[PDB]
């Protein structure tokens, strides 16, 4: 309980860092959209923890239910080219 339940906020922070890195590093941009959905669930978790569960539900309703759906709809209909993360392209940064 206490040990886990005290650091729930810290766990959400760590998961958010990891989810952002996974968004940027995803091979398939659809997988990137899914990791964006994961980040939004984590944000809803944080908002519940600080007392704003209504904003948790609103974020789930609008950003996942509407915006992420439009994202997926568009990437399905459209022909997107993407390159993979690599040293040759990205270690220079």
């Amino acid at each position: 309980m206490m040990y886990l339940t005290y650091y729930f906020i810290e766990i959400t922070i760590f998961l958010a860092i990891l989810c952002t890195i996974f968004i940027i590093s995803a091979k398939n941009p659809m997988v990137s959209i899914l990791y964006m959905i994961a980040l939004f669930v984590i944000a809803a978790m944080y908002l519940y923890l600080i007392g704003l569960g209504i904003f948790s539900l609103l974020y789930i309703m609008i950003y996942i239910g509407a915006i992420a759906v439009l994202f997926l709809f568009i990437i399905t209909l459209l022909d997107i080219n993407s390159t993979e993360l690599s040293v040759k392209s990205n270690i220079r940064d």
């Binding site: 040293v87 040759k88 270690i91 220079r92 940064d93």
Partner: protein, 178 residues
């Protein structure tokens, strides 16, 4: 005037120039085309780190040195500092006319900067908007932005000096007979 500590201030400048050159090298490495790795950033830097470091050293050291030697603070010190900085930057041309041109013209531009106050924004307290202006009152000393109808002749004699028409007494009064 109490002296600048030329050595410590110049060392600070060395650090800042090295940092700024490192940042410029990183940006140069990210913005360029062609293959680029993490070690090529200094390989293909163009010597930009040296530009930054050398300019920092030259300007700060020369400025502090000239200020301490003259025991003044004014635009001339910035003229000397700009001269040295232009010398550093014009050394890269490897040509004597260009080296001289950088020296004198950077020195002149930085002297112009130092003469205006050596700042990019304003010294608000000294500005005309924040200063006594208009016509002075009864017998007050005239300040920089104030205007009078007559100045004291003693002030004129002090400022211009005696000679070529400037005299402590008007001529007709002095040559009056009795």
């Amino acid at each position: 005037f109490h002296p600048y500590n030329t050595l410590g201030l110049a060392t600070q400048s060395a650090m800042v120039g090295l940092g700024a050159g490192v940042v410029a090298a990183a940006a140069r490495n990210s913005l360029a085309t062609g293959p680029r790795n993490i070690l090529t950033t200094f390989s293909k830097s163009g010597g930009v780190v040296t530009i930054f470091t050398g300019a920092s050293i030259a300007y700060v050291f020369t400025y502090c040195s000239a200020a301490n030697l003259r025991e003044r603070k004014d635009g001339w010190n910035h003229m000397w500092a700009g001269a040295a900085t232009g010398a550093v930057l014009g050394a890269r041309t490897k040509l004597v006319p260009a080296f001289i041109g950088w020296t004198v013209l950077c020195g002149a531009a930085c002297g112009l900067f130092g003469w205006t106050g050596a700042r990019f924004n304003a010294d608000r307290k000294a500005s005309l908007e924040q200063s006594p202006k208009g016509f002075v009152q009864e017998d007050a000393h005239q300040t920089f932005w104030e205007v009078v109808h007559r100045r004291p002749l003693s002030l004129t004699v002090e400022q211009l000096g005696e000679g070529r028409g400037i005299n402590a007494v008007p001529i007709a009064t002095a040559t009056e007979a009795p």
